[PDB]
Design a protein around this ligand. Structure first.
Ligand SMILES: CCCCCCCCCCCCCCCC(=O)OC[C@@H](O)COP(=O)([O-])OC[C@H](O)CO
Length: 93
């Protein structure tokens, strides 16, 4: 497992670019790597994603476009097509 508070917090500086703002900024990428670097386990990734998935539902300016390219533009391994409708609960490590 992991700390949900750390999941969304790590995307603090990313929220901007994720909300349609400019980016991904250099300060944002820093957290993205730390967040993904932590989710090395199965139960760690499921919670991490789900955590952001819920906190994203309460957002109206959420730009799914910046969310998918967020980890990509930051040079990160993610063969996933990034789908907010995807069940992160059925994901492995
Ligand atoms: C790291 C693992 C892979 C990530 C997969 C990425 C694909 C999904 C990305 C979809 C977008 C999710 C992120 C939304 C941005 C965000 O979560 O901001 C955090 C902020 O809204 C606070 O979240 P909270 O602490 O849960 O606060 C919730 C409160 O209801 C909001 O008013």
């Amino acid at each position: 497992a992991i700390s949900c508070g750390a999941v969304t917090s790590d995307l603090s500086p990313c929220l901007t670019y994720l909300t349609g703002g400019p980016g991904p900024s250099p300060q944002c990428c820093g957290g993205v790597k730390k967040l993904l670097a932590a989710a090395n386990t199965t139960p760690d990734r499921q919670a991490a994603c789900n955590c952001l998935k819920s906190a994203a539902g309460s957002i109206t300016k959420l730009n799914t476009n910046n969310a998918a390219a967020l980890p990509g533009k930051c040079g990160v391994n993610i063969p996933y097509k990034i789908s907010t409708t995807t069940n992160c609960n059925t994901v492995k490590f």
